[PDB]
Point group: C4
Chain length 394, copies 4
Amino acid sequence: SERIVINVGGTRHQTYRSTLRTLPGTRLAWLAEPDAHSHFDYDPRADEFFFDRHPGVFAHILNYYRTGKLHCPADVCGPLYEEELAFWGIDETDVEPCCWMTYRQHRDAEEALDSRRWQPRIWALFEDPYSSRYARYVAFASLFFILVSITTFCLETHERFNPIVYYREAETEAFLTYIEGVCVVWFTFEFLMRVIFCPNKVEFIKNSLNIIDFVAILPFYLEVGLSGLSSKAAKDVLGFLRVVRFVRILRIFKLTRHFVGLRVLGHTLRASTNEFLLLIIFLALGVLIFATMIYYAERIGAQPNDPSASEHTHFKNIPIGFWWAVVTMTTLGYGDMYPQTWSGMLVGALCALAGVLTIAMPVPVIVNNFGMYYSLAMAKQKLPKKKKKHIPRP
Amino acid sequence: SERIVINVGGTRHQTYRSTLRTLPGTRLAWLAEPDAHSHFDYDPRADEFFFDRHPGVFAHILNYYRTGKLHCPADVCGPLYEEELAFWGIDETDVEPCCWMTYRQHRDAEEALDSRRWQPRIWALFEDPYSSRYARYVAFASLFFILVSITTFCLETHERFNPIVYYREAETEAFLTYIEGVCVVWFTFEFLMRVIFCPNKVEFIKNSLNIIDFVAILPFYLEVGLSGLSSKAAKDVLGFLRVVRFVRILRIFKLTRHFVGLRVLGHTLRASTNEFLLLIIFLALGVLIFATMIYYAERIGAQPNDPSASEHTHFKNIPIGFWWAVVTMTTLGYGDMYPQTWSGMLVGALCALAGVLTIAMPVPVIVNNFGMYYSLAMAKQKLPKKKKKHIPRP
Amino acid sequence: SERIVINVGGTRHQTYRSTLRTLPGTRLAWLAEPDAHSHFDYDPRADEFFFDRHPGVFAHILNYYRTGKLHCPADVCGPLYEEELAFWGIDETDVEPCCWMTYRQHRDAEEALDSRRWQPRIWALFEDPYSSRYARYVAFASLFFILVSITTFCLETHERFNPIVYYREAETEAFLTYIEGVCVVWFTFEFLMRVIFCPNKVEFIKNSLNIIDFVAILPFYLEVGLSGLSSKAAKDVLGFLRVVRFVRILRIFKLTRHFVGLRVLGHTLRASTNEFLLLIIFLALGVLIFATMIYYAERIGAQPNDPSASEHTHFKNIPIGFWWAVVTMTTLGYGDMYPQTWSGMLVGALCALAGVLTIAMPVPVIVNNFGMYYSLAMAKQKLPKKKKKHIPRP
Amino acid sequence: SERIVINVGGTRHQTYRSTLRTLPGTRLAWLAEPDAHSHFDYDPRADEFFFDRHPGVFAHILNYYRTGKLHCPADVCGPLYEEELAFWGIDETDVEPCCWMTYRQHRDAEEALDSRRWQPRIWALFEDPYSSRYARYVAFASLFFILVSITTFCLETHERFNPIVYYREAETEAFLTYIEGVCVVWFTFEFLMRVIFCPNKVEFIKNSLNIIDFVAILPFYLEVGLSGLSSKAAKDVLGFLRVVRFVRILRIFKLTRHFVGLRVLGHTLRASTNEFLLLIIFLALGVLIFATMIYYAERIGAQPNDPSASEHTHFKNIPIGFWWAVVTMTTLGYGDMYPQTWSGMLVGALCALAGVLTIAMPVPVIVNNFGMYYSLAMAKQKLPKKKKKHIPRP
Ligand SMILES: CCCCCCCC/C=C\CCCCCCCC(=O)O[C@@H](COC(=O)CCCCCCCCCCCCCCC)COP(=O)([O-])OCC[N+](C)(C)C
Ligand SMILES: CCCCCCCC/C=C\CCCCCCCC(=O)O[C@@H](COC(=O)CCCCCCCCCCCCCCC)COP(=O)([O-])OCC[N+](C)(C)C
Ligand SMILES: CCCCCCCC/C=C\CCCCCCCC(=O)O[C@@H](COC(=O)CCCCCCCCCCCCCCC)COP(=O)([O-])OCC[N+](C)(C)C
Ligand SMILES: CCCCCCCC/C=C\CCCCCCCC(=O)O[C@@H](COC(=O)CCCCCCCCCCCCCCC)COP(=O)([O-])OCC[N+](C)(C)C
Ligand SMILES: Cc1ncc2[nH]c(=O)n(-c3cnc(Oc4cccc5c4C(C)(C)CO5)c(Cl)c3C)c2n1
Ligand SMILES: Cc1ncc2[nH]c(=O)n(-c3cnc(Oc4cccc5c4C(C)(C)CO5)c(Cl)c3C)c2n1
Ligand SMILES: Cc1ncc2[nH]c(=O)n(-c3cnc(Oc4cccc5c4C(C)(C)CO5)c(Cl)c3C)c2n1
Ligand SMILES: Cc1ncc2[nH]c(=O)n(-c3cnc(Oc4cccc5c4C(C)(C)CO5)c(Cl)c3C)c2n1
Ligand SMILES: [K+]
Ligand SMILES: [K+]
Ligand SMILES: [K+]
Ligand SMILES: [K+]
Ligand SMILES: [Zn+2]
Ligand SMILES: [Zn+2]
Ligand SMILES: [Zn+2]
Ligand SMILES: [Zn+2]
């Protein structure tokens, strides 16, 4: 018997019996066997096996058996087709690459997004801005002191607050130190309170954000407690430890983890490393080629080993041409170094065009990834919540 | 009985009785009840309940009951599916986020776009260019005087019309004052005519565009009536009130409200504030980081507290590096300040690349919003009009 | 009777009789009338009216009657739906704006793209490169002489070919005149041959490309025949007529009309004038606003009418700020004028960001139009030809 | 008889007999013939011819016969429709151009991507990094020596390694020669081993990458063996042969052929030559026009043949204006030459805007091509492998 009619939700699909056996182990293959009447309930009169699934995609599911290739329809959402083919016992790895990228589009993004009686209350005072009426004030104070520290760090590098008076040297003002002292007092209090009243201290140390808070207060204490005699080494060590203050601006990442857009940016960066590598490689190759070409172009009609050749051109060598190539490919154009010869002008035009092309090739991939993640997150926060409202298991 | 066949427009959908009860309160749930024969007319012979709706989307509507997840088909317009699921008594908030953004795509844009016997005629003389044979001429005259005022305001800042003669000072020409006098006469006449013959004076004051028209004529009268003795304070107050003349260029917005593209731009700006905030935050973080990094890079191999370190570099400090970072991230490249050291060159390349990336991330969202709004508005004005031509209520 | 079943290609659509009358005058409305049995052939047994059209779109065509709104399906090409609704006697102007832009997508582009026994042979010698074995050589010669003329015109402006000897003056070389003489001889021969052996001389004059060929040879003859005495006016008229030689570079458009990409560019420009107007308006408003703001920003903390205020800033006035604003909004950055004050720096950052935003808003529309036209043209030339191969009228 | 019902997978399509004959030679045309009962098996009772294909696309396949135009549905993958219409014996060249570009979208990209007992082992030691435990080390050594050679070549052009001592001249250091000697020894060993133990020596010579490896070592041997007497010609030939060392940086392409992104880039370049030609033509026309216009604009109100006119402007001539136009159209803005007159400023603004427009027109085509190729390749490498798992021929 070849007439095996299948009633999927009302539509009476029909095909030959031999076709269903092309994929042994699947539900249709089991159905096609003669000893399947009891396994699947069917009406003997109509002689049709009934199912309660989506009839639209069953056509493609069966066409897999017919032609031997699996495709996902473009008129339905990917997850729906995934659920249907999971019900029908078909692996999703067999989908052809013509329609795999869009099929595996929402799930990958979803997964990427998904990536002592006072201890609880004390730990909940910090680490969560919106969890009580007091955590918000603590977060605001932390933000205020972080911004004050960043501002003071930026001011310390100015010439108005570093007057020259150890013959003359340059001595920084004092109030810039008192402000940082107050900020450091607050930060050390917060750090002690967090570290003492926290579980799994090892995870706390590994958080990679407490290290920043520790190293941002260490230099102040080292400076205050290491300002004694023995200037020969003390002055040098203090001068080279004053560079560690750059870690004060990294505490701002301890505060932006709550902002949604920056989480989306982090996910996008973590999901598009290959594109960054490709961009770097393209830029390196182009920079090398165009530096060499401009170096040779700016010397046509010149004595090879003549000092005069490298006198009327900014490209004294190839290594310095990397800077010019990088500036030209990005359409930046500082103007510190430009060609002064017609062949150099042609090379510069080629460099600018090729730079635009190379830069514009991978960037759209990262942009599309970011757009996907951002739309998904904003839609996810648009919907407040929803109960199952389905009472499954009929 | 489990055989509950549904005839939706001709297609005979079939499913188990238990499935329809998974969503109590919905039309299908009421139908599945035994006491529903009289509620919904059906042929006892065929034993099928008839409906007169779209059969294509009923498959998805029922698959919601089957699998427990709601999706909108991608082969039909969103509004059609919305109407169908409103007929079937299903809330649109249950649609999964995999297909919610496109489903809520046209309606949000449509809503955003949708955002004394002489009093009527006198008020209609103004406030509406295309409403009579005389309003057009009034609008043209207003445009002419507005452009004249803007041109005179721009000229007043030039050195040819501000010769030096109160020892020398700089005295502006007189014709530039006579022109503005004529323009102010016209503007005050128009303002009086509008304010006198208008309803709900409070709304008139709150319009936020009449305030501009008032403040753009106030300084002229203050100047003409405040040019007496007591120079010690009169000269200073006049000099600092001469800055208020910048409000003369804002009257051009009173005239561009009719242009469609600028209304679309206003809607796009009002609908994409989060993207602007995200762009600002990204730029701020990048600027801070790259300013710090360039400041430190331009000093490798230097004495920490040595005046010579900040002698052969444009980056005397971090605050001035914000300007360089902003210029470099935008591919602008004025050239007023550029790195002069290899590490500085690497930092500059990184800054340019990261700036391109960050700028290109959110901007496409705003661009897509603007494109949607513009296409919708231009299509809306392409169609002149159309009667219902449906005679509903069959 | 309400059971009016419609058999469209096999699918048995069913609906109430009253529904079909909602749109009087249409084919379905006529069918629903009791006196329609003879008009449309149907089987009395099945009691179903047969049609031989596409069943898929009939669902939407009937849903128009059901719900009262017309939509075009997104799983089929627009022209197919247009043909179907033309067969069903429904106007295409009733489609809702949610799906009108894509429906009217291919046809508009197609229409835009669609926009004496020796007289025939002589006229066919020119005006068509690929029409014989001799027209190609004539076109190549014309191209050669056009390029020679352009090169000579560009050289005439150089300082090497204009030595100073009417005391000194500057006298151009002679060979640059002999070359142009040869080119002009060829061009006048071609122009005479074209004008003499052509129909509808008025259309020839109106072609707008023969005027260029005439004005590009007129100055040479005027110069050669107007080099006599009376220098007082002859020298001046010759000097101001030497400017007309710029029309020699416009003959290149007489030759690029065959290239497909430039025809596509012309169509895109002719189809996107509103976007250019919008871009111009946006740029003008931004330039004005930012020029005013930078002018005022560069003077904070200054004496209003003090010559010293306009001494340490490039923005002596607002009009010169238009140039800076235009350069900054485009990310060009010549560097001839930049802010030197922190408020000026903030204004410049805002200007650059707003310029990027404004420029990026309408340009994508033009880009999409160009892509559509280019893809359509390249696909049209990919297909060589095809006979009807349908033998219609069955 | 006109009732010819077709049972395609369960759906009972019906149409007139005359319709099927509109396309003679096709399977449906043969079926419609009276002598086709035995050719195609069918049930005499149901009077319906059975098929085992996809019912969804059969509607469009038959609509081709109905209306006379062929379209591909947008709810299925192109290859599926291609297979179906190949089964139904319909040529794919008849598809209208409204839906041809997307139909021929995956296949073109797929095709483009698809574009002495020791001889085998010895040849497999090279030419394949991942084929053994020793080839990887050889590839790493080759990479190390290639990078060393490139670094030495770049250093040779510096002034620190070319001190001045044939009166003074400039003599390069010696260690830079010893390093290159070691690298050349390795490279010549590798080249000999490859050329000796390879088949079809002609293909080896034609590989176009062995020529680079040969010419990159030839100059070293020529220099070492051509440093004798007869300086008059020896010095000149050595100086002009020292330029051939630029071929040392091209060996890096012998190593990047394995990287996937660069193969994708090569395919994209090979598939988008017309777009590059179009970009070049657009840039040339714009450059010419804007150079002429700026040359004329910077001279309004000047004596035609006066030396003073070309004294206060950077545009001494039109040829030098090509450089300015190229720099301005790309938003690069070096600043070496800028307009200094209001008409020049207007021309510059127009040039910048038109340059942005022209550059942005074709580039998106190349970007889309690259995105398609990259996504296809990355998806192809995501899937490790898969057996047929279909056992065809039922
Ligand atoms: C992927 C790659 C992409 C590449 C894209 C780009 C590809 C670019 C491709 C090619 C560009 C080629 C440009 C070559 C320019 C040479 C000019 C020169 O050196 O002149 C000097 C050579 O002479 C001297 O320096 C001193 C005299 C020695 C004898 C010279 C004899 C002639 C040699 C000829 C050797 C030619 C062959 C050289 C080797 C090829 C000076 O010559 P002169 O006669 O002494 O003085 C003339 C003065 N006059 C002009 C005022 C009358
Ligand atoms: C997110 C973050 C991303 C970051 C990305 C980027 C990451 C970048 C990471 C790292 C970059 C590290 C660069 C370090 C360069 C130091 C150079 C220097 O100071 O030399 C001076 C130090 O000496 C003096 O100034 C005076 C003498 C004092 C004693 C010095 C002993 C050596 C100290 C060594 C301390 C090393 C450790 C310093 C602390 C690390 C001069 O030395 P000299 O011997 O007096 O003179 C040499 C002269 N000669 C060269 C001509 C022979
Ligand atoms: C869409 C729109 C977007 C807009 C976005 C941007 C929005 C931006 C919004 C606001 C920005 C506001 C900036 C104001 C800066 C004023 C500075 C100034 O003029 O100082 C001079 C005024 O004095 C003189 O010039 C001479 C003395 C006359 C008496 C002055 C008394 C104080 C007046 C105050 C009037 C204030 C109010 C002015 C009117 C507002 C000098 O003062 P001095 O005391 O003589 O000398 C001080 C010297 N010292 C500093 C070294 C000690
Ligand atoms: C696709 C294309 C896109 C194009 C877009 C752009 C399109 C742009 C379109 C048009 C722009 C047109 C600009 C014209 C400017 C001319 C200025 C000039 O030359 O003045 C000089 C002419 O005179 C001399 O040089 C010496 C005296 C000779 C007699 C002059 C008589 C007047 C001639 C008039 C001939 C006019 C017609 C010229 C031919 C058209 C000096 O004149 P003057 O009187 O000696 O001195 C005045 C001094 N004063 C001002 C201080 C009082
Ligand atoms: C270093 C030097 N010093 C004195 C020189 N004198 C002189 O004439 N040249 C020279 C310069 N470039 C040349 O070719 C060019 C031109 C443009 C780009 C380009 C090339 C390459 C080599 C193919 C690589 O990319 C040639 Cl062939 C020569 C002979 C000189 N080079
Ligand atoms: C202010 C100053 N004054 C004199 C100095 N002398 C000297 O050598 N440095 C110096 C400079 N940059 C350093 O590191 C770099 C390099 C590039 C970027 C970058 C860094 C950080 C600090 C990790 C942050 O981002 C180091 Cl480690 C040092 C020792 C000096 N800094
Ligand atoms: C012409 C002049 N000459 C001497 C001055 N001295 C001085 O202090 N100002 C000044 C400058 N800009 C001011 O405001 C700013 C700042 C930035 C941008 C901006 C504004 C506006 C006016 C709101 C418009 O856009 C103010 Cl309020 C003042 C008082 C002076 N202006
Ligand atoms: C070479 C020269 N030398 C002395 C001159 N003195 C003078 O006045 N001109 C001049 C300059 N440009 C003119 O027109 C312009 C303006 C801007 C752009 C543009 C044009 C064209 C010609 C239509 C082409 O594109 C005119 Cl009409 C004239 C009379 C002079 N030109
Ligand atoms: K740029
Ligand atoms: K730039
Ligand atoms: K620039
Ligand atoms: K610059
Ligand atoms: Zn979905
Ligand atoms: Zn719609
Ligand atoms: Zn189509
Ligand atoms: Zn497919």
